[PDB]
Symmetry: C3
Subunit: 488 residues, 3 copies
């Protein structure tokens, strides 16, 4: 009769990494990194994005004639824009604090267009100006949200306007100033020189003067238009005054819905899907903690690390080979992790130990949960745009994002390596503990063989083996008989 | 004669958390997180703070008539401000580079006010102007550190002033420009249209032009006052020139004491107490590495982490139970950690090993220390203000702070969770090593029992027990009797 | 006949730090931190640096007469600039966006000077102005790269100029505006009052007006000169228009080479020496991965920490003392780490176990390589310059750099401590496993002496001792012989 102690081996070829060894085959493993996407830009939480197309943010807000599908847009979740949009300010010029406007848009989910200053109130001026830069079907045209005020007859009276914010929320207002090419066109348009444009609120004052100078021709014109914007608060008033060179607003953008949004720079097209996380390359449909697809991401998403493989060992080391546990593992054990093999006059067979296997199972489950359920609250790494005169700020942003990402990559990798090593040591210690427990309970009644086996000095029936398996072995009951067999 | 090897158990009911298990009851534990404060604002290192009350920095430095208690201010440790102060600028207007000034004030601990331009030197201008926005007992008044130059008779000559910095430190100078509402106001106040204000130092050049427009009424006036500040160096001269619309300074602020300070945004009041670390919720009196009261602290403070519990283990696992360490721990060996129980003819009592307990004690103490004093901090008077045109910078600062705090929280949790398991394995490994050493030194003269206890073959008195315990058991002397008793 | 299991010791005196104890002596150790430099400024990868001497970047780029050796500079790898340069703007004034220009220069490795506007094409003006603040041997002189335009007779026509970038790369163009001291000197230099300077490109448009005021005298003058710079793109045109107070450019700086360079604030001089890493204190020549010389480095460089020492344990714990591993190591086993000492009738000597020694060697080497090669990202800590109106941004940069620095230092120190502790535990576990293996194989034919050695009951020559050393021991062959003496 004999009883021997061993562990479980199977046909798995999964491999994990430790701090002392590389490419170690294990019975079970868990991958906590996601490396695949569907390659599609699709809807997030039911609300589709805002597909700008060839438009730009300024082109959409100002009302570019070639951008007219966005004159009334519903609620969105994120704004899809191209790297170098082709429909933009058609009239050459600039747009002050453009990146601040984009940052503000990164937290707005719906706009409502309110006619604050109608086009028919300017009864002392001409409001039908246009340029061949923003041409519609050949004939000249202009932006569809702005009014170009021009002299009516040989007179340009002082243009005055005002609006009180009785809409319910904060409003966004954009106006412009025209810089001509020569004095002749300034006289032919506004009839007066030394003009000014004044915009005023309770917290804002601004006065601008046109500047006339020959400039390199962009889009065929040497003139420019400079645009500015403001955020009018509730129950506040905005005042416009101008003696010339004013591009007045006709509409204002009320912030209806607010939340966490963003601007995604892609060249793709929206496709009918649904997801909870979105990256420029594609969407992510997972429950795993980590991913390595793309740093930029909108929505609740797994964290990002620059790694190729992050695999946690949850099973024993696969060393296929009766002897026991020192020689190698067993392929016949299909019930648990650690167990016994018994051979007596009534037969032979394998069996598993419930207590130790369960203790190790909960231990490994707790370890996996602790790694996953604490490695959350990582960084965000969301988009942000900077101008050509803010290079130091852009470098600071890049360095900060890169440093945090590197730190988290290091943390995850070292954690996984150390826990894999400790798990393997844990399993070895558990097998040794079972062997030592059985040896201590059996004492001198048996003989060790050196392979993890025990050979009895008496007869162990099936109930005797059940007793030794469940730790109720009666040493005196078989002592005296053994005292014969050993001595003979 | 039985010698059993065991470990100490008490009635402690404190729990640690390892990475393989949760809620492990432990004999002795050390909390390294502080969660309590006194809820009061106190003096830092014996120096009382500067209580601004309902006044803001601009109101204090400009001399608002209702902030007249702050005209002479002694040394301070930190400034206390309200979120939305209500004495800021009686005359509506703006303050240029306000956030930069507030950041400069975070490294200044005392100001000394010098008279740089006396009010009576303007012998060709009227210097008794005031507004009803800054009203005292109904009559109009003005800021106490500024002079409003107006016309004396029907003429406004060129106002010229200069000051050479012989005070002995860097000086802070604030001037202002008045923007009226209508042309009639400009004629009535300065008698000339098309005026300028020129301020010049050896580094700073500034020319400003008054601008006249109709504005929404704030505090009952449509006019504005724009204030600017400069930092004049030692032995440098400042020059003011104006043809109108100059609000001249009368006082300068010499930086008398420099140090590490800050601005703390609270709504409370100073109370009679003395502290060394101050948070917006209250003071901290602790000697621990971590805390979770508030991120923004001033003084010598521990590090902030978003962790609810952080408890290190210093003692054994509380497994209560004569047997040995196989069954559990002893509740009656209150002398140390690892020890021996014995039972011979002349007595039955416990004991405690000295060398092993001392080594474990020093190891645990060194581990706790190395965890604690590995963390090196500084004054860390964090806090920065940003304007409404600077939102990308605010987001950058917030993200950097959040990322660093998250990294440190993860580090602390990892360290505690790993060291807890390491210590809990250290203890039972030490117990097993003591058992193995005793067995090896005793050899075959004794009999194992499977519950951590050794039965003796010869009669062992107290001298032999002490020889076993100290490590000088004589196998040759007790050999023959042991063999005779064993062979039977 | 005896065999003993033990390990190896020597006379080394290297010390390491663990997490449970301090100042532990080891047999072998590896220092991974560099603390030495050559105290020299060398040539990076065969390209000598650009030594500005007592010059500033503005002085070099504008043509300061004292900085006449830099009128044609060759390729450079980095720029060397003093902390407080003495030769810079000879004419008092200011440079707009100076720090942005320095940041741009931090990635340019060669410049080419192209004549874009010659000095002989201003046929209607005077182009020989000068000042004594930029004197050359007493006589007045001006910047060598700029032209000062003054009236030819009592007439100042409109100055117009243009340049089309047909060079082949981006160009850098610098112009200036002159702010006089009095109206008399404005009339004696430009003949008209109320002048302007207009500069226009495809993306930039700017108009500036001179200001006339009396200012404190710097370098004997009360007038000032304000300089601005622009980056002209390929196939783009720049236009200059002026009615007075224009300091026109003559040369443009085409960017010939691009790469990774930098600016070093040092007070030294270049010396004939070569390196691949450079710091302001000296050069680094090493293969180790860490150093604690200076945060700011240029070239292929190691990583930087704030630690005083970092030593990795690649050997055993040195405990000198025939008995085995219970009492300590051996000094006669100079062949490997673990081994056996044997004593029979025909001799007695030491030996080594190749399998366990090789396994430990591989594990230690893999751990060390993992520690070294996982530090691949780290940080870089570039140098940036900020003006005195950007103190918040400067503090943000400093705080971020410091935070990352202590994060990485903490990581390195904790990793070293934990690796040292694990190595010293694993070395003892290996010897214990070897002893257990030999004991289990030899079974009951031997007696244990309690000090790591075994005494054979039978007689065993070298054949059987190399049989037990290589794990091939025949228990039945000596079973009866051992039983004969054991039962006696
Ligand atoms: C309205 C118009 O056709 N203007 C053209 C101008 O006209 C004269 C007319 O105004 C006057 O009463 O009588 C004389 C004859 O006695 C002329 O008939 O003549 C210019 C040439 O000398 C044309 O100049 C060219 O304009 C180009 C751009 O045209 C547009 C544009 O598409 O941008 C046409 C718009 O109608 C015009 N006006 C408005 C109110 O939008 C704008 C406007 O001039 C721009 O703001 C210019 O900065 O320009 C090119 O600029 C070309 O270089 C230029 O020679 C006028 O079109
Ligand atoms: C000194 C005074 O009371 N001036 C008021 C002005 O009176 C004239 C007189 O000075 C002139 O010689 O002759 C004319 C008649 O031809 C007047 O009799 O009359 C104005 C209206 O017609 C007043 O207008 C109102 O002023 C308000 C402001 O007064 C205060 C203020 O409360 O802030 C205080 C001072 O009276 C005034 N002057 C000075 C030197 O400080 C200042 C100042 O005017 C403004 O604050 C900035 O320009 O303001 C309100 O502004 C109200 O809206 C306005 O109608 C004159 O007060
Ligand atoms: C060319 C010259 O020497 N001009 C001096 C000027 O002379 C006048 C003369 O040019 C004119 O034709 O006739 C009248 C009489 O009808 C004068 O004789 O006289 C000024 C004082 O009366 C001098 O003033 C002093 O200039 C100093 C500066 O000299 C430099 C300098 O070192 O910066 C050099 C040149 O003279 C000049 N550069 C030119 C003209 O291209 C510059 C120029 O003034 C700059 O704009 C400096 O702001 O000045 C000192 O500035 C001293 O403080 C001042 O009194 C004229 O030098
Ligand atoms: C491994 O064995 C399992 C039986 O449990 C079988 O389903 C699986 O296909 C086998 N895989 C390989 C690669 O042999
Ligand atoms: C581990 O496997 C990878 C590929 O599977 C191989 O590139 C690498 O060399 C292997 N390393 C070892 C130590 O076997
Ligand atoms: C704007 O309208 C609100 C009511 O919606 C009113 O209380 C406020 O006085 C108005 N503003 C002005 C300047 O009249
Ligand atoms: C635990 O034992 C100690 C003995 O020193 C005793 O003072 C303490 O009160 C006990 N715990 C409780 C909760 O009573
Ligand atoms: C540990 O105790 C906490 C209460 O402090 C409880 O919420 C948690 O479920 C417990 N966990 C286990 C595994 O008992
Ligand atoms: C200011 O005073 C110092 C002496 O205190 C003197 O050296 C310096 O020249 C003065 N400044 C001017 C512009 O005169
Ligand atoms: C370790 O040795 C160094 C010698 O450089 C000594 O300064 C230090 O105090 C020692 N530490 C301990 C704990 O003995
Ligand atoms: C500048 O030169 C290029 C040829 O290199 C030409 O195509 C372009 O039209 C020129 N620019 C202007 C404004 O003429």
């Amino acid at each position: 009769d004999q009883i021997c102690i061993g562990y479980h081996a199977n046909n798995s070829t999964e491999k994990i990494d430790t701090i002392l060894e590389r490419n170690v085959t294990v019975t079970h493993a868990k991958d906590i990194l996601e490396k695949t996407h569907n390659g599609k830009l699709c809807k997030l939480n039911g609300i589709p994005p805002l597909e700008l197309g060839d438009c730009s943010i300024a082109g959409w807000l100002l009302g570019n004639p070639e951008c007219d599908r966005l004159l009334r847009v519903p609620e969105w979740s994120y704004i899809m824009e191209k790297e170098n949009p082709r429909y933009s300010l058609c009239y050459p010029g600039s747009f002050n604090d453009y990146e601040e406007l984009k940052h503000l848009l990164s937290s707005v989910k719906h706009f409502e267009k309110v006619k604050i200053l109608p086009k028919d109130r300017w009864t002392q001026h001409t409001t039908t100006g246009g340029s061949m830069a923003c041409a519609v079907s050949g004939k000249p045209s202009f932006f569809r949200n702005m009014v170009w005020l021009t002299t009516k007859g040989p007179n340009y009276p002082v243009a005055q306007g005002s609006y009180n914010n009785t809409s319910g929320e904060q409003m966004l207002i954009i106006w412009g100033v025209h810089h001509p090419n020569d004095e002749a066109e300034q006289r032919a348009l506004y009839q007066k020189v030394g003009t000014y444009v004044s915009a005023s609120t309770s917290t804002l004052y601004k006065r601008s003067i046109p500047e006339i100078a020959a400039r390199p021709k962009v889009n065929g014109l040497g003139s420019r238009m400079e645009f500015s914007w403001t955020l009018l608060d509730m129950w506040d008033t905005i005042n416009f005054e101008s003696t010339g060179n004013l591009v007045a607003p006709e509409y204002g953008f009320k912030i209806s819905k607010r939340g966490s949004s963003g601007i995604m720079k892609t060249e793709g097209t929206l496709e009918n899907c649904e997801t909870k996380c979105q990256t420029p390359l594609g969407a992510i449909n997972t429950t795993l903690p980590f991913h390595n697809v793309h740093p930029l991401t909108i929505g609740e998403c797994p964290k990002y690390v620059k790694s190729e493989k992050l695999v946690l060992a949850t099973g024993l080391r696969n060393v296929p080979q009766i002897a026991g546990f020192i020689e190698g593992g067993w392929q016949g054990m299909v019930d648990g992790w650690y167990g016994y093999h018994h051979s007596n006059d009534q037969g032979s067979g394998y069996a598993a130990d419930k207590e130790s296997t369960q203790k190790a199972f909960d231990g490994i489950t707790n370890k996996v949960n602790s790694v996953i359920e604490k490695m959350n609250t990582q960084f965000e790494a969301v988009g942000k745009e900077f101008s050509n005169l803010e290079k130091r700020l852009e470098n600071l942003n890049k360095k900060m994002e890169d440093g945090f990402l590197d730190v988290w990559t290091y943390n995850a990798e070292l954690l996984v390596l150390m826990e894999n090593e400790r798990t393997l040591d844990f399993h070895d210690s558990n097998v040794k503990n079972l062997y030592d427990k059985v040896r201590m309970q059996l004492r001198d009644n048996v003989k060790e063989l050196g392979n993890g086996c025990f050979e009895f000095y008496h007869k162990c029936d099936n109930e005797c083996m059940d007793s030794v398996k469940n730790g109720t072995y009666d040493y005196p009951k078989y002592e005296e008989e053994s005292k014969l067999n050993r001595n003979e």
